[PDB]
Amino acid sequence: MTDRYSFSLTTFSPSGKLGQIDYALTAVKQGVTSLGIKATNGVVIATEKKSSSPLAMSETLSKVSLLTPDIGAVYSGMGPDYRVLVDKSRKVAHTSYKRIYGEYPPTKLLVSEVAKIMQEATQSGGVRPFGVSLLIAGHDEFNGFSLYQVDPSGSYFPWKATAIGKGSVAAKTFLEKRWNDELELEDAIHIALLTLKESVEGEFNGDTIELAIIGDENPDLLGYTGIPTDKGPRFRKLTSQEINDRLEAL
Amino acid sequence: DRGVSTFSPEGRLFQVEYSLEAIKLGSTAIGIATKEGVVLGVEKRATSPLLESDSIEKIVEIDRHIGCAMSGLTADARSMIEHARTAAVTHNLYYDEDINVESLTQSVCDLALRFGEGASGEERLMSRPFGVALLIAGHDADDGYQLFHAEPSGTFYRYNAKAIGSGSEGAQAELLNEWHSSLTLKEAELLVLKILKQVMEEKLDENNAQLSCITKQDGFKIYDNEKTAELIKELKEKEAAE
């Protein structure tokens, strides 16, 4: 027994490529399209809920995950890899930040933590890189709203708007045409729905699409009252109904 | 690839056999055991005239009653010598007596097969076998003068005379005819000097060859160049004598 794979599984090829990272990126390309758009007063991330069977209950599978009360994530590529990455991200936000400073980490730093975890699977012994690309959207007092992309290599970059997966090329092109630095959150949501429609083959409704935003504080989602400084989470997943309402104004 | 402790189809350990090949490429070393002591001689074999020949140490003291000569990847012998010296001194601390030559040899040979990448038997943390063979010579009250050949195989044989290194097969054949149970220390000295001269590429002199011995009375001693130069001169004369 005993993991005896203490050597890297990702290494440099004569051309300077890191094969396993490239292949991981290839897996991401086959993944369902997901995207994110930053507005002046919010950020939206969305993706398609590609139900693998009509007997499956799509709700019991959230591709859009809350990491902190002001940060959420979405992805493209291997769902299982994403699921564990979310468990680890939620935990590091605590162990490496909240337990130290008594406040949640700012979007860029948590992204940095996630990225590190991914970088390590690119060099540590006996592992393969994560086959996913994430899009993290969040908000923190001193940085405002932000949107980041994290790739299998562990590299990350901030975006005004972007898409990953299957039809990223097309979707990115469509976003560049509609994006401006004056979009309000509702505008971004609308643009998100339009961009996502081009990537969806079949049914396009609030049961096949998953969408969340980082916007104003939801004091109604807090669960308690009595502390003025605690106003509620900025992260909010939209309901199937809320989505359909906006699809009629499509 | 292939494990470092893999068996060949003929029942031999590859790394050990390949080890023996490196030892064949080493400088010649010869030992002769007599009832008057044991002689140990080696071929310095310097690689350049600028190399100070006396900084070549292929004959070393283990303890006052034990000396040893090496052949092969000599850098590999340092930890072996170290282990040997520690073993001899440790024995004396625990038993207030000298360690027997055979026990000292058996202890050095115990390190031999301690190599591999995780062999289920203990913790053999050594990536490859030693690439050097040794001639351990000494004296002890129970078995008198003794000469041992310790190989990277962990096995050690006792000999009346033995040669190791590049000219071993030839030198050994010579020792076969020259050795007899009544040789005197002086005869053994000249005899070792003569065989080294035959197998050495260079013309043997007191600078590219070195002699030593161990006697019950004075223990292990390395002959200084002057002492050897004379013995060399004496050898040339007896040879030119017929």
């Binding site: - | 010296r85 001194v89 601390l93």
Partner: protein, 212 residues
């Protein structure tokens, strides 16, 4: 116990008593309190018999190992620091030792290091260790001269131990003498204190307060 060592023109004099006691019980009158580390190095033992005997013998093994490794005689400074550093690793565990490491090397000349279980290591000219030390110091301090002859130095050391053997209940039995030269130490006998006392009293005229 009374042990002493001093440096002089002829090298080093080492003198010790040979009594062992546990409380008021005289366990022995013939114990060795000098360890012959090797032909050139001597060590004195005060405090715990086992501790000194064990570690000073072990020291000898370290010295030998050094000489095989460096093909050169170990210095007294280095030999004494091996013991010192070893003992220091055990600080607080309860080792009990007061010792003198004595040697004569070409490089250093006559050298004496005091080494104890507290981790103290002192180079010096004169040292006395043991319950009888103060007695030996009085005799040594008032008769010591660097220009003493090997003969007189030997006597001074023997006399100093005698002084202590007489007054100190824990010292006595016999006196063991050593002379340390650059070529090694020379044993100078075992002198029963019983006989030695009377002889010295008569010949010297000292110990007048004792009826003989």
């Amino acid at each position: 116990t009374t042990t002493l060592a001093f440096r002089f023109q002829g090298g080093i004099i080492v003198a010790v008593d040979s009594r062992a006691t546990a409380g008021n019980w005289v366990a022995s009158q013939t114990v060795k309190k000098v360890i012959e580390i090797n032909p050139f190095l001597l060590g004195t033992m005060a405090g715990g018999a086992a501790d000194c005997q064990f570690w000073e013998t072990w020291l000898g093994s370290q010295c030998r190992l050094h000489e095989l490794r460096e093909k050169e005689r170990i210095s007294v400074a280095a030999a004494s620091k091996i013991l010192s550093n070893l003992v220091y690793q055990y600080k607080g565990a309860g080792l009990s030792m007061g010792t003198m490491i004595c040697g004569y090397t070409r490089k250093e000349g006559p050298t004496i290091y005091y080494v104890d279980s507290d981790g103290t290591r002192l180079k010096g000219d004169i040292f006395c260790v043991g319950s009888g030390q103060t007695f030996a110091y009085g005799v040594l301090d008032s008769n010591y001269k660097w220009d003493l002859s090997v003969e007189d130095a030997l006597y001074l050391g023997k006399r100093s131990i005698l002084a202590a053997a007489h007054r100190d209940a824990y010292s006595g039995g016999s006196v063991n003498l050593y002379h340390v030269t650059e070529d090694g130490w020379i044993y100078h006998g075992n002198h029963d204190v019983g006989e030695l006392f009377w002889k010295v009293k008569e010949e010297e005229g000292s110990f007048n307060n004792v009826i003989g």
